[PDB]
Amino acid sequence: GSGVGISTGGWVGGSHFSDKYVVTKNTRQFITTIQNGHLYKTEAIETTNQSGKSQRCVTTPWTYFNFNQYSCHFSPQDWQRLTNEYKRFRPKAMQVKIYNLQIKQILSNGADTTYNNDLTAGVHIFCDGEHAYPNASHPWDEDVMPDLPYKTWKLFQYGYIPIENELADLDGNAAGGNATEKALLYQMPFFLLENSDHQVLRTGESTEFTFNFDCEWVNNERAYIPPGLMFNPKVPTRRVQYIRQNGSTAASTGRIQPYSKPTSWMTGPGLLSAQRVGPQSSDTAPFMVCTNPEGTHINTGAAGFGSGFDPPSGCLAPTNLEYKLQWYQTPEGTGNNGNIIANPSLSMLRDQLLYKGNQTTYNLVGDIWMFPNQVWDRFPITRENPIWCKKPRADKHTIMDPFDGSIAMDHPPGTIFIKMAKIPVPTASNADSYLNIYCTGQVSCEIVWEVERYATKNWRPERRHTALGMSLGGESNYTPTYHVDPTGAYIQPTSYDQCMPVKTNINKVL
Amino acid sequence: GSGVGISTGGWVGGSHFSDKYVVTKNTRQFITTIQNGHLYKTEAIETTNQSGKSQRCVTTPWTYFNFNQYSCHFSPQDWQRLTNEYKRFRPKAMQVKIYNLQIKQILSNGADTTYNNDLTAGVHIFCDGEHAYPNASHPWDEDVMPDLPYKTWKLFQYGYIPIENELADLDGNAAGGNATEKALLYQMPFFLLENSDHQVLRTGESTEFTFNFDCEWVNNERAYIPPGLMFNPKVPTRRVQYIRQNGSTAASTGRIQPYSKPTSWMTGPGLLSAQRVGPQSSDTAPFMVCTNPEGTHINTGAAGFGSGFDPPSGCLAPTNLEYKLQWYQTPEGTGNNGNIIANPSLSMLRDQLLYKGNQTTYNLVGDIWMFPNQVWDRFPITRENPIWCKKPRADKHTIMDPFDGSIAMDHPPGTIFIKMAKIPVPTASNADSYLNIYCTGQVSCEIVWEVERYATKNWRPERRHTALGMSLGGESNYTPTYHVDPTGAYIQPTSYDQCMPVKTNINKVL
Amino acid sequence: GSGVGISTGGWVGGSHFSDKYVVTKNTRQFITTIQNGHLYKTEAIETTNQSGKSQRCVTTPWTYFNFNQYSCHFSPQDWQRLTNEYKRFRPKAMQVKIYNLQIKQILSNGADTTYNNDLTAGVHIFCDGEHAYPNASHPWDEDVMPDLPYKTWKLFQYGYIPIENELADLDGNAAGGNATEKALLYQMPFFLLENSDHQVLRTGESTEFTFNFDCEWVNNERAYIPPGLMFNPKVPTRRVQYIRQNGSTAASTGRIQPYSKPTSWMTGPGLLSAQRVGPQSSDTAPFMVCTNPEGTHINTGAAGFGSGFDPPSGCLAPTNLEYKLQWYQTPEGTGNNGNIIANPSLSMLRDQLLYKGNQTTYNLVGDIWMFPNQVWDRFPITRENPIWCKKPRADKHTIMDPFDGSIAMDHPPGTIFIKMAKIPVPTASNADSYLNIYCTGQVSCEIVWEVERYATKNWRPERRHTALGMSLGGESNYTPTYHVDPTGAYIQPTSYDQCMPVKTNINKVL
Amino acid sequence: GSGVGISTGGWVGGSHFSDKYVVTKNTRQFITTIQNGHLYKTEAIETTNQSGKSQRCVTTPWTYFNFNQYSCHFSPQDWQRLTNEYKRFRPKAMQVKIYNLQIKQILSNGADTTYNNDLTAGVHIFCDGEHAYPNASHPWDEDVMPDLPYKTWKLFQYGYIPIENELADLDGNAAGGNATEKALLYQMPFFLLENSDHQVLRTGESTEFTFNFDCEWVNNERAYIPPGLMFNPKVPTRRVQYIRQNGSTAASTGRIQPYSKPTSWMTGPGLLSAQRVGPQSSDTAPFMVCTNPEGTHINTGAAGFGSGFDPPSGCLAPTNLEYKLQWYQTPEGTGNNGNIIANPSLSMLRDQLLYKGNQTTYNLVGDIWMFPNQVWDRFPITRENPIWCKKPRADKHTIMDPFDGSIAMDHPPGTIFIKMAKIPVPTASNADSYLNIYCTGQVSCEIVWEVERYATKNWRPERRHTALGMSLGGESNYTPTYHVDPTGAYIQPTSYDQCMPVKTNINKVL
C-alpha cells in the first residue's frame, strides 16, 4: 500500500566491485529549511570592502543536492581498492532517489521549541537535466554530500550571479553617462525555478531521478619515464647537432650522442609567470580572466572585474606553494589547520618543465602555451576531488583539461532542487506571513562506475596505497586517519598521500 | 493511492510556443479564509459622504478565483515573444485545477497564534459556467492572480449589487410616497451560492475545471498609414471639388488635386465633449450611464445614480490626460506613484481625429457617433490588461469594442467560488459560534492560446519590444524592470512601453 | 489493508511438542532508544585503574536483538518436558518477526515528560547473516531476551573492539619508538552498519527474518559408569602386569586381576594447574590467552594483554570453586546473592580425573591435553545457558567443545540490528541537534527444535527433573521457584538443580 | 476499505422470536484499563482477620468479558414473552464481536486530565475455548454484562487461585516440619496468558468469536400436583397395609384406602441439617466442602479450609431464610436493601419434604441423599440467574443439578480476555515505566436460543407473568420496575416474582 505510516524506501549503501563495473550505493539523511522566507532577492555580496571587489547574486528559496565529489560515493576502502586494482574508471550511470520525507512544523514558544508533524505539507522537487537554469554546483564547494553515511546532510541555498557587478557598477561618470553599462542591466536574466514544471511530494510519496553519463575516463596509471626517454641509449643516432660559434669556441658539427637523443615531444602547457596579489579578502589568483567591453567604466581595475584562474600551471612543476592545488578537509579549517597541499605523484607526464637555452646556459620558460606534440597527464585526483565540471556553452573551445582535475561535461548530472512548499498564514496586514516548517528525508545516490583492470609485464612490485601511509589523530592521538575520535570526530587525512590519489600506483609503458 | 499524505497534483508552469498554439501553464499558492462569519449581508457602501453617491452590495461568505489578466498567464519573456513573433492570438482553451488543499485550524491564545491541521475539514468549490449567479470578476480589479509564481494568492470575498441604490433610496417625499421606488425593492434578487450543487473537498481530494473559449482575435499588427492615404498621389483623379462663394472669393469648380484624394473612410467613434467632475471620492467619469424610470425620486442627481463611462474616447486622440487610460501596477500605489498612462502605439487606425470645416477653417468635432465607413483598431492592450469582459444579456446591442481593450464575451470563463465549509461549535446560547479555519492550496491555470505568425513583404526592419526599453528601479536603483529588488521587491514597469503593448511592432498593409 | 491503525501481526507463543520436532514460539515487547546521539565513538573502557587492564571499543548508534539462551525459548514447563522426555535436541530452524512498531516522540518540559506519536518516523532494521560486521552477541550476556513473556525487553547498544589496547597502547619508549605498535593502529578496522543495505520501517510496516541451523546435537543422556568399567569382572584377562623392583620388593610378573582390567580410554582434557589472580576489577581468569607480536611494548604484562580462558577444566573434576562454572540469575545480583554454581550431574563421562602413579603411590595430573582415546561429555547445560557460540574464522582449529557448554557455530543466527532513524532538527549553529524519539514494538522468535525420544532396556526407574526439586522464595517465602512474588517479582532458581540441567536424567549404555 | 476513520461494525440489538428459535442480539460499550501495571502477582487476600479464613490469588494484567446471566441477553419484555410462550429453551449458538476499538492516552497534569488518541496502540484479545487457563467466570458475579444497552461495561481484572491457602499455610510446627505442605507449594501451577497465541488489534481492526453450545434444556413448565398424587382416588387398590402393634392397639392388617395410595416416588435430595456459622466476614455456609490430605497442618479449622456449599437444600422446602437463595440487584446494595429472596414457584416437583414416621407420629428427615425413584425440578431460574456453570474435570461425578439453577457445562463458552498492550517508556532507571492508556470499544453478543412452544389440553386459564406484578420505585415512587427514575436510575425488581421466574406459568401433566 501507500500512505502515512508506510515507508517509501529502505536504506541502501555499500559497493559491489566487478571486473567491468563498480556500483557504489549511498544513502544520507538530509534536512532543508525555508530559505529567504520564500523570496527571490538580488543583493550585493560585499567583502570587508578594503578593495572594490564585489559580487551580486540572486538568492532563491530553493536548496539543492550536490553529489559532486568522490569522497561521497567511495569509502576509503572502496577508494583504495579502486585505485589499486584498476587502471581507469568512469561513471556509467547515476540513480538518485528521494524518499521517506518528513515535513514537520516548528513551534517556538519562548526559548524552547517543539516539532509537530503536519502530514499535509508538501515539498517541491525539481531536477534540471537540460541545464535551463544556472548551475548550482561548482567544484570544490562545501555543499557536497557528507563522507560518513550517518552524518546529516544540510542542503545549501541556491543562488546565481545574474551579471558581472563592476560591468553593471553604475559608477560611470558625468562625462560618459554609462549608457553601455545600463544596457547590461536592462538585459540581466532573471530565473525563477517556478517557470518549469516540477513535482510536489507529501510524506507518503517519493521521487526518483536517473542520469546516464557519457564522458572521458580517469586514468590511474603512472608514467615511469618522461616521453623524452622513450629511446634506446645503446643504438647510435643518425642526427647531427650543429652548434653555432660561441665566443672563442668555434662552430662544431657532430653526431648527436647516443645517450641523449632528441625528443619529438614537448612540455604540457602551463603558466608560471604570474603571482598572487593582495589580501586574502580580494580575489588573489595569479591570472584574472575578465571581460571589459568598450565603453564600460571600471574604477577599481585589477581583480575587481574578472575571476581568478588557479592553479595556473597545468602540467608544469609547481615551483612555489602558490601554484600547488590546496584545500581544507573540514569547513572548520582555518589557515594551516587541516589544509592539504597537492604533492608530486611521481608520474613523469606530470610536473614537467621546459628550459630555453641560450648559447651559454639554460633558463626556465615561464609560461608555455598549447604547442604541437605536447603530451601530459591530468591532475592526479584524490578522493576529495570533484567528479565533474560543467563545460560552458560556447562556439569555440580548446582542449578541455581542468587543472583541478575535474571532468568537463557539457551536460553534467542535473541539479536536484528542493524547497518547502509555502504554507501561507492569515494576516490582517500585507505582512504575508507564512508557516514555519522543514523537511528531512532520505536521499540515495547510486552510481554505476565503469572500470577496467590493469595488466602488466613489469617484473617488479609496484607502489600501492597502504594503510601504513596514515597518521594518528584525535584526542590523545591514538586514532588513525578515516576513523572516529572518542568524542565521535572523524579523523581527516593530513596529507595528500592519505587522500590516495590516482596516477601513482600502476605503471604504464609510455 | 489516495489520502492524507499523498499529494494530489504537482506544480506546472512555463510556456510552450508553437506556430499554431501557445500553451501557458501557471500554478499559484492561494489562501482563502472565513468571510462574513459565514453570513450573507446587504449593507450600504458609504464614501466620505461629501456627495450622495452610495452603493449597496450583498456580501457572501464565498471567495473566488479571478484569472482575468494577461500578466498572470504570460511572463515578460513569454509576452515579448508573443507580441514580437505573432500577428494575432486568442485563447483556445483553459484548464483550472485546484489541488493540494490544506485546511488548518487557527488557535489563538493571547497574542501568539498556532496552526493545527485538522484533516477532516472540507472546502466548498463551485464553478459557475452558466452565469446563473452575478459575475464576480470585473476588469481592472486587484483580485487577479499574481504575476510572480512564488507569491501567495489571497482571494477576495464575493459580493454583488442587488439594486441601484438611489433608485431604492427610500428618500422619496411625503407627496409621492415612493410607490414605484418600493416596487424596485420588492423585486430585488437575492442569490445564494448554496442553491446550486457544488463539490466539497478534503485534503486528499482535488478538482478540475475546463473551459473552451470561442471569441475574437487580438490583432498585434500596426497600421503605418491612415486609411485616408490608401491612394496613389501620382495618378490624377476624376473627381471635382466645388467650393461655394466665400466672402469676396468667387465659387470655384476644379479637379481635386492628385496628392490629396477624397477618403471613403471616416473616424472611429468616440466622445471628447465631456469632462470629469467633482472630488476623487464621487464617481468622476466624464459621462454617466444611468437609469431613471419615471416616478422614482433622485435627490442628489448627477453621478449619484449611474455609473461612469470611461475612457469616453474610443478611437479618438486623447486630447487631455483625463481621457487617457491609466492604472496602477501595485495596490500600494497612490497618486502619481506607480501609475501608468497609455501612450500612442503609433498605429494610424488609432488616435484618430475628425475636423468639421466651415468656409474659413477647420474645427475639431467634439463627439462622433457610429457612422458608416468607420474603421478603427481596438485599444493597444498591454500585458496588464484584462483578457475578457462579460457582455450583458440584452435584446439589442451595437458593435462590441470595450474601450479598455478587453474582449466582450457573452459566456466568459466561469468564476470559481470557494469557501470554508462551516464547522459549527457547541454553544449554550444562540451565538452560533463556528470554528476558525482557513485553507491554502495550489491552483493551476493552463490556457491554450491560438496564435498565427506574421509574414510581410516589407523590406525594412520593424519595431520590436526590447529590454533596452526598460528603466532601473529598486533601492540604489540598479535593478531593471521585471526584476527583484535586494529586499525582494519586484520592479514594476514605470511606462506604458515597458508593459509591451500590442499594435506597435508588426506592420499591416491597410 | 495496511497503514496506521491496522496491526501488522498478532501475538504468538507457547510450544508444541511432537516426537520429531518441538516448536517454541515467543513474543516480547521491546524498546530501543537513540544511542550515542547517532554517533560512532571509540573510547577507552577504563576500570578502577588499579591495574593496567584497559579496553577500547567503538560504540555505534545501533541496538540489537540477542536471542541466545535457552531460558528465552523454553518455559520451565517446556524445559522440564524437553529434558525428561528426549535424549537429544537441536534447533532446526528459527524465524524472527518484528512488527507492531510504534515510534513516539519524547517531549520534556521541565520534569514532566509527554509522549506524542509522530507516525512518520521510521526505524532502521538490519540483519547480518553473513557476519560481515563484528558479532554483537557473546555468551552469558545480560542482553538476552527476557524469560517472562510479559516483561519488556530493553535492547542494548552495539559496540565492538577494534584493536587490542595494550598492543596499541602507544606507551612504547624513546628507544623503540613503537613502529610496529603504530602499524597495528594504522590498520584498525572501522565498521559502519550504514555500509550495508537495510530496511527502514514505519509503524504500518513490519519485517521478517528466517534462519536455518545446521549444528551438532545436545545430548541429554547420562553415563552410569565410566568407560573404564566397560568390562566384565567375572571373565579372566589374558594380559600381564609387570611391576619393576621397588625398594626391597622384587619385580613381579603376574596376570592382571579380573576385577580391574586395563582401560583403553583416557580422561577428557582439562587444566587444573592455574589459579585466579588479583582483584575482582582486573581480568582474573586462571589462564590468559594473549597475543604479543615481537617489537610491541607491554608495560603492565600479565592479564593486561589477553583475555582469560575460563573454566579451564573442561571435563576434569572442579577441585576448587574457582573452576566451577558460575553465574547470576538476575542483573541485580551481587556477590553470593543470587549466584548459581554448577554441580556434578553425576554423569561418569563428566568430572573425570587422571592420576599419575609413581612406584609408591598415585598423584593427580594437574593439566592434561588432547591425547588419543579421550572420551568425554560436554558441559551439562541448564536452561540458563547460551545456545550457541560463534566459531572464529581461522585456518586450523582443534575439536570444538566450549567449556561453557555452548555450541560453536561458524555461522550462528544473524544479529538483528535496529536503531532510530535520525530525525534532524534545524539549528542556526553546527550543533547538529536531532529529534528525541524511541520505538517500541513486538518481536517474535519462533524456533523449530529437532528432538528424538529415548528408548531404554533398563528395568529400574530413572531420575527426572521434578518440581519437588525447588525451594520457596519471595517475601514471606511462600512462593516457589519460577513463580511470582506478591510484589510481582519472579522467583529465580537458587541452585543448579533447579535450573534443570541435561545429562542427568536419561541413562545411556556406554 | 479499512483504517482509522472507517467504523469496523455497527450496533446490533433486539430479539427475533420464532417458533423454533429466538435470536437475542446485544451490543455494549466497554472500557478496560491497565491492570496491575502489567504484572502478575500472587498476594494473600485477607479479610478483617477475625477468623483464619484467608485466600491467595494470582492477579493478571488481563480483563475479561463475562456474558453469563440471562439479564444480559433478554430484556424484561423478551424474557416475559420467553417464559409465557415457551415450555423450554436452550442456547443453540453464540457469536461475540469486538469492534470499534479506541485506544486513548491518559495525560494528567495536576488535577485535570486530558485524553489523546494515539491510534498506533493495540490491545491483546484472547479467547480460551479449550479451557487451558483457569476459568475467569463464576456464577453470581457482578462482572457480568449490564442490563441496559446504554450503560458502559467496565471489565474486571482476571485472577485465579493457584492453591488452597491453609493447605499451603506454612504454619506447620517444629515437630512436623510441614514437608507435605511444601510439596503442595512446589507444584503450584502458574498460568500466563502470554503462553498462548492471541490477536493484537488496533483501532481499524476487529475480531469475532463464535461458540456452539450443546447442553440441557431449561424447562418452564410447572407441576400442578406432586408425583405422589398421580393415582385415581376412586379406584380401590389391591395393596395391604400391615401396622405392627403399638402400645395397646393391636396389629392391624387391612386394605390401603383408595384416597391415599402408596407412591413409588420419593423426595429429591437436599440437606436441611446444617446451619450457617460465624460473622459475615468468614465463609458462613452451612456445609463446607474441603480437602485435608494427611500430614498437612490446619490451625484454624472449620471454614478456614474449604468452600461453603450453599444453598444446601436442593429440592427440599427452605425451612429457614438461610436456605433460601438470595442475591442483590445492584452492587450498591447493602443488607436488606435491594436484596431478592427466592420464593416458591408453586411447582409440586419443587419445595418437597420427607417425613420419617415412628409408631406414633411423623418427623422431618433432616438430610436426604440420592436414593432411587427420586424426581425433582431444577431451581426456578429468574432473569437474573447465571446461564451456565463450568463442570469440573473429574473421573467420577453424580447427577449434575446445581442448586443455584445454572447449567453445568464441561465446555462452557470460552472466556474472552483483553488487555492493554504494554507501551514501554524510556527511563534511565530500572523503573520499567509504561505509557498510560485505556481502550473502549463495542462488544456485541448474539445468541441463538432454541425454544419449543407448549401445547395443553387444560381447559382453564393459566398463570402468566404480568406487568401488574410490579411495584413503583424511584424518587417520588411513581416509576415502575424496569423503568428509569427521573435522575436516570433504573428501577430494580424488589421481589422474586418481579424477576419473572420459570416453572411457574405453564402446566405439565406429571
PDB file of N, CA and C in Angstrom, chain A residues 2 40-42 56 105 120-121 124 185-186 188 190 194-195 197-198 200 202 204-205 422-426, chain B residues 5-7 11-14 29 100-102 115 117 149-150 152 438 440 467 470 472 478 480 483-484 486 488:
ATOM      1  N   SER A   2       0.198   2.395   0.273  1.00  0.00           N
ATOM      2  CA  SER A   2       0.881   3.677   0.334  1.00  0.00           C
ATOM      3  C   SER A   2       0.156   4.599   1.297  1.00  0.00           C
ATOM      4  N   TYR A  40      12.758  35.652  -3.767  1.00  0.00           N
ATOM      5  CA  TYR A  40      13.917  35.881  -4.610  1.00  0.00           C
ATOM      6  C   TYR A  40      14.438  37.277  -4.315  1.00  0.00           C
ATOM      7  N   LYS A  41      15.751  37.406  -4.210  1.00  0.00           N
ATOM      8  CA  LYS A  41      16.389  38.656  -3.850  1.00  0.00           C
ATOM      9  C   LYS A  41      17.700  38.765  -4.606  1.00  0.00           C
ATOM     10  N   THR A  42      18.009  39.962  -5.091  1.00  0.00           N
ATOM     11  CA  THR A  42      19.318  40.235  -5.676  1.00  0.00           C
ATOM     12  C   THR A  42      20.031  41.230  -4.783  1.00  0.00           C
ATOM     13  N   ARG A  56      27.277  40.294  -7.084  1.00  0.00           N
ATOM     14  CA  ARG A  56      25.831  40.433  -6.976  1.00  0.00           C
ATOM     15  C   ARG A  56      25.213  39.093  -7.332  1.00  0.00           C
ATOM     16  N   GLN A 105       6.399  20.802  11.531  1.00  0.00           N
ATOM     17  CA  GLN A 105       6.202  22.204  11.843  1.00  0.00           C
ATOM     18  C   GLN A 105       7.016  22.596  13.062  1.00  0.00           C
ATOM     19  N   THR A 120       0.234  17.061   5.959  1.00  0.00           N
ATOM     20  CA  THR A 120      -0.361  17.518   4.708  1.00  0.00           C
ATOM     21  C   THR A 120       0.555  18.470   3.960  1.00  0.00           C
ATOM     22  N   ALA A 121       1.718  18.776   4.516  1.00  0.00           N
ATOM     23  CA  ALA A 121       2.605  19.705   3.839  1.00  0.00           C
ATOM     24  C   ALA A 121       3.465  18.974   2.829  1.00  0.00           C
ATOM     25  N   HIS A 124       8.521  20.859  -2.842  1.00  0.00           N
ATOM     26  CA  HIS A 124       8.788  20.964  -4.264  1.00  0.00           C
ATOM     27  C   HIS A 124      10.105  20.270  -4.549  1.00  0.00           C
ATOM     28  N   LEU A 185      22.553  45.969 -17.605  1.00  0.00           N
ATOM     29  CA  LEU A 185      21.479  45.743 -16.647  1.00  0.00           C
ATOM     30  C   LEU A 185      20.164  45.461 -17.346  1.00  0.00           C
ATOM     31  N   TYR A 186      19.781  46.306 -18.304  1.00  0.00           N
ATOM     32  CA  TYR A 186      18.486  46.144 -18.953  1.00  0.00           C
ATOM     33  C   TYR A 186      18.271  44.711 -19.391  1.00  0.00           C
ATOM     34  N   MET A 188      19.489  41.709 -17.995  1.00  0.00           N
ATOM     35  CA  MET A 188      20.068  40.899 -16.951  1.00  0.00           C
ATOM     36  C   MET A 188      19.103  39.769 -16.671  1.00  0.00           C
ATOM     37  N   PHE A 190      16.702  36.874 -15.322  1.00  0.00           N
ATOM     38  CA  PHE A 190      16.129  36.562 -14.026  1.00  0.00           C
ATOM     39  C   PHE A 190      15.418  35.230 -14.135  1.00  0.00           C
ATOM     40  N   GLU A 194      10.131  28.426 -10.638  1.00  0.00           N
ATOM     41  CA  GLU A 194       8.708  28.133 -10.752  1.00  0.00           C
ATOM     42  C   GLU A 194       8.249  28.101 -12.199  1.00  0.00           C
ATOM     43  N   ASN A 195       9.027  28.680 -13.110  1.00  0.00           N
ATOM     44  CA  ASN A 195       8.694  28.569 -14.525  1.00  0.00           C
ATOM     45  C   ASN A 195       8.490  27.123 -14.933  1.00  0.00           C
ATOM     46  N   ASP A 197       7.908  22.970 -14.835  1.00  0.00           N
ATOM     47  CA  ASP A 197       7.070  22.021 -14.122  1.00  0.00           C
ATOM     48  C   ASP A 197       7.919  21.224 -13.149  1.00  0.00           C
ATOM     49  N   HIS A 198       7.382  20.969 -11.962  1.00  0.00           N
ATOM     50  CA  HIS A 198       8.078  20.111 -11.022  1.00  0.00           C
ATOM     51  C   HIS A 198       7.083  19.437 -10.095  1.00  0.00           C
ATOM     52  N   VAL A 200       5.420  17.973  -6.571  1.00  0.00           N
ATOM     53  CA  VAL A 200       5.164  18.285  -5.172  1.00  0.00           C
ATOM     54  C   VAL A 200       4.885  16.972  -4.463  1.00  0.00           C
ATOM     55  N   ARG A 202       4.277  14.754  -0.803  1.00  0.00           N
ATOM     56  CA  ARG A 202       3.981  14.661   0.614  1.00  0.00           C
ATOM     57  C   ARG A 202       4.682  13.442   1.203  1.00  0.00           C
ATOM     58  N   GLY A 204       3.943  10.448   2.158  1.00  0.00           N
ATOM     59  CA  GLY A 204       3.776   9.129   1.580  1.00  0.00           C
ATOM     60  C   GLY A 204       4.489   8.953   0.256  1.00  0.00           C
ATOM     61  N   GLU A 205       4.638  10.028  -0.502  1.00  0.00           N
ATOM     62  CA  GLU A 205       5.210   9.982  -1.836  1.00  0.00           C
ATOM     63  C   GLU A 205       6.733  10.023  -1.814  1.00  0.00           C
ATOM     64  N   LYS A 422       5.371  26.681   0.217  1.00  0.00           N
ATOM     65  CA  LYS A 422       4.985  27.764   1.100  1.00  0.00           C
ATOM     66  C   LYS A 422       3.600  27.497   1.651  1.00  0.00           C
ATOM     67  N   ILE A 423       3.485  27.466   2.970  1.00  0.00           N
ATOM     68  CA  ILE A 423       2.174  27.377   3.593  1.00  0.00           C
ATOM     69  C   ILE A 423       1.823  28.768   4.105  1.00  0.00           C
ATOM     70  N   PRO A 424       0.932  29.480   3.439  1.00  0.00           N
ATOM     71  CA  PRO A 424       0.581  30.823   3.883  1.00  0.00           C
ATOM     72  C   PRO A 424      -0.134  30.793   5.214  1.00  0.00           C
ATOM     73  N   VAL A 425      -0.212  31.963   5.827  1.00  0.00           N
ATOM     74  CA  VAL A 425      -0.868  32.140   7.113  1.00  0.00           C
ATOM     75  C   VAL A 425      -1.767  33.362   7.001  1.00  0.00           C
ATOM     76  N   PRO A 426      -2.970  33.334   7.561  1.00  0.00           N
ATOM     77  CA  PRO A 426      -3.818  34.521   7.514  1.00  0.00           C
ATOM     78  C   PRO A 426      -3.223  35.640   8.345  1.00  0.00           C
TER      79      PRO A 426
ATOM     80  N   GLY B   5      -1.364  12.636   3.062  1.00  0.00           N
ATOM     81  CA  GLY B   5      -0.002  12.212   2.847  1.00  0.00           C
ATOM     82  C   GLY B   5       0.335  11.832   1.427  1.00  0.00           C
ATOM     83  N   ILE B   6      -0.620  11.901   0.510  1.00  0.00           N
ATOM     84  CA  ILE B   6      -0.376  11.669  -0.905  1.00  0.00           C
ATOM     85  C   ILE B   6      -0.773  12.937  -1.635  1.00  0.00           C
ATOM     86  N   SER B   7       0.207  13.629  -2.212  1.00  0.00           N
ATOM     87  CA  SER B   7      -0.079  14.883  -2.890  1.00  0.00           C
ATOM     88  C   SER B   7      -0.982  14.618  -4.076  1.00  0.00           C
ATOM     89  N   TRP B  11       3.404  20.635  -9.438  1.00  0.00           N
ATOM     90  CA  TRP B  11       3.464  22.011  -9.895  1.00  0.00           C
ATOM     91  C   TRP B  11       3.657  22.041 -11.402  1.00  0.00           C
ATOM     92  N   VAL B  12       2.887  22.878 -12.088  1.00  0.00           N
ATOM     93  CA  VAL B  12       3.082  23.090 -13.513  1.00  0.00           C
ATOM     94  C   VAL B  12       3.331  24.566 -13.754  1.00  0.00           C
ATOM     95  N   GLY B  13       4.011  24.858 -14.852  1.00  0.00           N
ATOM     96  CA  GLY B  13       4.299  26.233 -15.199  1.00  0.00           C
ATOM     97  C   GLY B  13       5.057  26.277 -16.501  1.00  0.00           C
ATOM     98  N   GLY B  14       5.386  27.492 -16.913  1.00  0.00           N
ATOM     99  CA  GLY B  14       6.117  27.704 -18.140  1.00  0.00           C
ATOM    100  C   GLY B  14       5.206  27.962 -19.320  1.00  0.00           C
ATOM    101  N   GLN B  29      -0.039  29.550  -5.181  1.00  0.00           N
ATOM    102  CA  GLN B  29      -0.358  29.111  -3.834  1.00  0.00           C
ATOM    103  C   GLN B  29      -1.368  30.090  -3.264  1.00  0.00           C
ATOM    104  N   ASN B 100      -3.896  19.872  -3.734  1.00  0.00           N
ATOM    105  CA  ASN B 100      -3.010  20.036  -2.589  1.00  0.00           C
ATOM    106  C   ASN B 100      -3.614  20.969  -1.550  1.00  0.00           C
ATOM    107  N   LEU B 101      -4.896  20.770  -1.263  1.00  0.00           N
ATOM    108  CA  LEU B 101      -5.567  21.591  -0.270  1.00  0.00           C
ATOM    109  C   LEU B 101      -5.010  21.287   1.109  1.00  0.00           C
ATOM    110  N   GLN B 102      -4.951  22.306   1.960  1.00  0.00           N
ATOM    111  CA  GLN B 102      -4.622  22.116   3.372  1.00  0.00           C
ATOM    112  C   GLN B 102      -5.576  22.991   4.168  1.00  0.00           C
ATOM    113  N   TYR B 115      -1.186  26.891  14.569  1.00  0.00           N
ATOM    114  CA  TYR B 115      -1.880  26.350  13.414  1.00  0.00           C
ATOM    115  C   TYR B 115      -1.814  24.834  13.446  1.00  0.00           C
ATOM    116  N   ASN B 117      -3.463  21.190  11.937  1.00  0.00           N
ATOM    117  CA  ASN B 117      -4.118  20.674  10.748  1.00  0.00           C
ATOM    118  C   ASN B 117      -5.137  19.632  11.189  1.00  0.00           C
ATOM    119  N   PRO B 149       5.146  33.680  -9.878  1.00  0.00           N
ATOM    120  CA  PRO B 149       4.617  32.377  -9.460  1.00  0.00           C
ATOM    121  C   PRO B 149       4.895  32.026  -8.013  1.00  0.00           C
ATOM    122  N   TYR B 150       5.849  32.686  -7.367  1.00  0.00           N
ATOM    123  CA  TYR B 150       6.167  32.323  -5.996  1.00  0.00           C
ATOM    124  C   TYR B 150       5.452  33.179  -4.968  1.00  0.00           C
ATOM    125  N   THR B 152       2.112  34.424  -2.867  1.00  0.00           N
ATOM    126  CA  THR B 152       0.874  33.787  -2.431  1.00  0.00           C
ATOM    127  C   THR B 152      -0.310  34.542  -3.018  1.00  0.00           C
ATOM    128  N   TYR B 438      -8.763  27.976   7.988  1.00  0.00           N
ATOM    129  CA  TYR B 438      -8.511  28.523   6.669  1.00  0.00           C
ATOM    130  C   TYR B 438      -8.007  27.398   5.791  1.00  0.00           C
ATOM    131  N   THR B 440      -5.353  26.716   2.465  1.00  0.00           N
ATOM    132  CA  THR B 440      -4.405  27.072   1.434  1.00  0.00           C
ATOM    133  C   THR B 440      -4.262  25.880   0.508  1.00  0.00           C
ATOM    134  N   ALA B 467      14.408  44.790 -24.394  1.00  0.00           N
ATOM    135  CA  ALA B 467      14.711  45.025 -22.989  1.00  0.00           C
ATOM    136  C   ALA B 467      15.426  46.351 -22.802  1.00  0.00           C
ATOM    137  N   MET B 470      13.644  49.553 -21.049  1.00  0.00           N
ATOM    138  CA  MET B 470      13.336  49.384 -19.639  1.00  0.00           C
ATOM    139  C   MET B 470      14.117  50.416 -18.847  1.00  0.00           C
ATOM    140  N   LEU B 472      15.831  51.367 -14.725  1.00  0.00           N
ATOM    141  CA  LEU B 472      16.282  50.829 -13.451  1.00  0.00           C
ATOM    142  C   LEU B 472      15.367  51.268 -12.317  1.00  0.00           C
ATOM    143  N   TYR B 478      19.701  49.986  -9.080  1.00  0.00           N
ATOM    144  CA  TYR B 478      20.433  49.181 -10.047  1.00  0.00           C
ATOM    145  C   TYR B 478      19.648  47.971 -10.554  1.00  0.00           C
ATOM    146  N   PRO B 480      16.705  46.274 -12.849  1.00  0.00           N
ATOM    147  CA  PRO B 480      15.875  46.616 -14.003  1.00  0.00           C
ATOM    148  C   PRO B 480      14.405  46.367 -13.715  1.00  0.00           C
ATOM    149  N   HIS B 483      12.339  42.689 -12.423  1.00  0.00           N
ATOM    150  CA  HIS B 483      13.420  42.033 -11.710  1.00  0.00           C
ATOM    151  C   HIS B 483      13.250  42.303 -10.224  1.00  0.00           C
ATOM    152  N   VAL B 484      14.045  41.639  -9.398  1.00  0.00           N
ATOM    153  CA  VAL B 484      13.792  41.658  -7.961  1.00  0.00           C
ATOM    154  C   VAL B 484      14.806  42.521  -7.220  1.00  0.00           C
ATOM    155  N   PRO B 486      16.915  44.021  -4.046  1.00  0.00           N
ATOM    156  CA  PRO B 486      17.579  43.349  -2.919  1.00  0.00           C
ATOM    157  C   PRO B 486      16.656  43.008  -1.758  1.00  0.00           C
ATOM    158  N   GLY B 488      13.829  42.015  -2.143  1.00  0.00           N
ATOM    159  CA  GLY B 488      12.927  41.035  -2.713  1.00  0.00           C
ATOM    160  C   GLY B 488      11.784  41.642  -3.478  1.00  0.00           C
TER     161      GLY B 488
END
